[PDB]
């Protein structure tokens, strides 16, 4: 339809503020990861806890860089 | 559905038809200010008699306008009087109040004057004069890159919005090249015999291009270059052929006036009739 | 998709190695996201859009906070977000400077005046 | 649209565009879709292949009609036929730029009417300039020498393509003279 | 899957009446400017109407097909010579396709007057009018593979009037002997430039070489 | 409604925006959606129109009385100047097609560096009308003006300037 296309459309909007807010804070991640992250809390999750494994992670990627 | 959904997407007819034309948006008065403007009047209670609308949408008024300034006709919006295009004021697109639109799209119409006076000139010529004819044949070739502009920008619409703020600032100069024909023609047209009806027209380029010694001054040497060639000619073969050929009186030397060979004029003829009673031993 | 394969997906992302070449990363995943696959506290959307203020001005950033003021006008106009809060929470704790004191300022409602 | 308009420019009329010596091409004009926009443009277009029925038709009425034999010259004689073969190589650049016009469309059939109106314009001079050159000499009977007159005196003239154009047929009429020349003297 | 779907590019064609998102959906396209599909549709509703205003006895079934190559191997078939489907003894293509088809059926008939291995110098000239005949079916199918409806007659145009002048030069009375080559020498005085010069004078050239023979 | 104003700024202002021959682009017409106080702000905005319709008109008659070579020259600086006065009024119109929030306020903050620009290039162009500076003259006139003192008409009249100059190099190498 077309409001199957103007939801589709309406979401990549918002998910590119919301790069642009990334980006600003430069954190390390990308969009892909932001891909993860984005899914995650939809189905409700503790931002406390996902900070914790990639500040866990990104101290890991250098151990076994 | 079959033959009349081919109909329905690619035709445009809704004012080129008699049918009240719709388009499918937003609306709520960013868009919807012709509709929000009569609302107020009736809320103030006029009591009624509204304007004549009819709503075209937003694209249109361009192609249109762009077909008017190529230099077509048979126009709806911009409807003719007796040659000259005039304001419709039946039409609105969907904002721009009825009165807004009234004068934007009169100043289209008022270069619209120009370019079908332009044309009418041109038309004139075929349905020579050594000069007219010549400047026509300036004229035209000018009108031809004028007109593939028109053409790119009409090919583009299926290819950005379409609005009339960016297309009155896209066609800066050219509407500015436009009026300076304006003052050339008016002289052109103020005409007794072929030779001083010429060498007006011809005087007044002479000193336009010593006026401003931009794309002006490109515009008139197109226009000086390709009206004195006929008489380049026209001297060269009275010059080294001996004979005088002048008939009609159109050659300015008759064995206003341009000074373009004033200065050089006496060894001109000395030269002519010398080469004639060469002819002749 | 499905909770527990998206966070084995986020271990492929962060590090460089595949699924099927680590296992201890994801059992610590499953470690600590396990019995917290909500927020743990109540939201204030508002604070955390102060926070990123309190932020920016505090690295003196204080052109891309006024900047910030703008993006998140955008994110009320598009909303197509429900959980705006978790998000810019996150990405507020993973801060990362592009180149002091909490313990005052105030943290999100802990629910301890109510039972959970 | 498309190929209908370009086999009526080249001179095989169409139904689409009702060839007539009253009204010479004409479309149609009873689809209730048609722009009035384009119709302008269509008038502008039809023109051009009126004028180049007219040489055709000419053409073959004159040359290889017969086998060179009315005896009115300005229907008949060598020099006459020779006007007809200097013509078609006049005519050669417009079937140059139609072949062209043709691979654009099948590369894309979405080009616009302006384009093939703003393409084929270069001749919407010459093609007017011609036609009294050969309506006076069919009217008065002109016979011998005095067509290469009635050509070259519009081939002295201001529009820079009329002169190139008429100046070829010149050439191929003083062709037959010299033919008979080389013998005589 | 939502996220792998969210990587693509809007379509542009902005509105300005659309404030709440104007991506692109197209303000209704030109009627020219979608051809090759409207182009026959236009044709065929065209014919529909004058079908119409006749009452069905301007009837002609298949308005399209043939396309474009198949009425261009047809015409390559009826340019070798050999009769069409449709001729026996797009609405447009009737005018263009009877210039080249009048040629193929006047090269026939100068293949039937070719029938023969009665007139010394006949026999002669009949031989080399199968020089022009040869030639006429071998560039076809060495020029033309399938190439543009338009081009073939364009190009067989220089080359098919001379087909024409040769149908009147054959009866097809007709004499036959001197008669005949006198009758030939009379045609070389007729016409001498136009472009059927080299073809009278290849003709006369061998209906005269029997008779220096005598 | 998002053209209307982009055009009352602009030389089309329709009803809503009445034009008078002394200064123009009044406004009586009530909406329920402009504050009623917002008439004060669309007043704000207008004295900026009015000085670009002014400065058309003066365009329109150039490019005796007073004439010469450089109101075709000084006119022609005069467009420069108003060069990013066009674009950031395209460049409006384009964001607001995408969002429908922002309002008039947009329109007064972005264009608040022509509220420096318009009335004191504007006193020039008075100036140069009342007073008959018409022949060479006129680098002075507007040679005292450039030092500015408000940076937009610091930048403005140097850009006009420079091309004044540009014929007093032609006039200097016929004589010279």
Known sequence: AAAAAANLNAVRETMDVLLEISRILNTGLDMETLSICVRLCEQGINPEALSSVIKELRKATEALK | ?281 | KSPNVLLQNLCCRILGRSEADVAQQFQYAVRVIGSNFAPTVERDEFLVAEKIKKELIRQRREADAALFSELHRKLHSQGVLKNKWSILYLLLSLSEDPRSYATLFAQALPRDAHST | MIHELLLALSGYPGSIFTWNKRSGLQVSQDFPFLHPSETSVLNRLCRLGTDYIRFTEFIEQYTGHVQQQQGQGGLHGIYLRAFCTGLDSVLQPYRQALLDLEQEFLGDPHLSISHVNYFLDQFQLLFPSVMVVVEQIKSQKIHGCQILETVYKHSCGGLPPVRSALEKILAVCHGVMYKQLSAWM | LWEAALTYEASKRRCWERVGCPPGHREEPYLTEAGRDAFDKFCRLHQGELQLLAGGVLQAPQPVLVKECELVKDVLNVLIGVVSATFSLPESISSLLSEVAEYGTCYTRLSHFSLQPKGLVFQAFTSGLRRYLQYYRACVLSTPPTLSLLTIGFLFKKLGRQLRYLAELCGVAFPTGVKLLSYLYQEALHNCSNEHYPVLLSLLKTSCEPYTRF
């Not at chain 2, 694209?59 to 919006?77: A, C, D, N, P, Y």
Request: proline share 3%.
């Open chain 2, 1 to 281: 559905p079959d033959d009349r959904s081919w109909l329905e997407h690619h035709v445009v007819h809704q004012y080129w038809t008699a049918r009240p034309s719709q388009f499918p948006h937003s609306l709520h008065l960013h868009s919807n200010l012709a509709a929000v403007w009569d609302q107020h009047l009736y809320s103030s209670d006029p009591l009624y008699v509204p304007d004549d609308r009819v709503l075209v949408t937003e694209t249109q008024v361009i192609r249109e306008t762009l077909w008017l300034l190529s230099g077509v006709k048979k126009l709806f919006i911009f409807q003719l009087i007796d040659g000259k295009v005039t304001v419709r004021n039946n039409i609105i697109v969907t904002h721009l109040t009825h009165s807004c639109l009234r004068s934007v799209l009169e100043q289209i119409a008022a270069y619209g004057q120009v370019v079908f006076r332009l044309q009418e000139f041109i038309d004139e010529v075929m349905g020579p004069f050594r000069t007219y004819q010549a400047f026509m044949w300036a004229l035209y070739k000018y009108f031809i890159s004028f007109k593939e502009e028109l053409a790119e920008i009409e090919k583009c619409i299926i290819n950005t919005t379409i609005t009339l703020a960016i297309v009155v600032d896209k066609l800066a100069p050219r509407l500015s090249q436009l009026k300076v024909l304006h003052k050339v023609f008016s002289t052109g047209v103020a005409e007794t015999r072929n030779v001083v009806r010429a060498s007006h027209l011809l005087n007044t380029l002479y000193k336009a291009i010593l006026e401003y010694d931009e794309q002006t001054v490109s515009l008139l040497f197109s226009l000086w270059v390709e009206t004195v060639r006929p008489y380049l000619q026209t001297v060269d073969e009275w010059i080294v052929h001996g004979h005088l050929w002048d008939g009609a009186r159109e050659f300015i030397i008759q064995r206003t006036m341009v000074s373009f060979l004033k200065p050089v004029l006496k060894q001109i003829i000395m030269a002519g009739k010398s080469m004639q009673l060469l002819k002749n031993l």
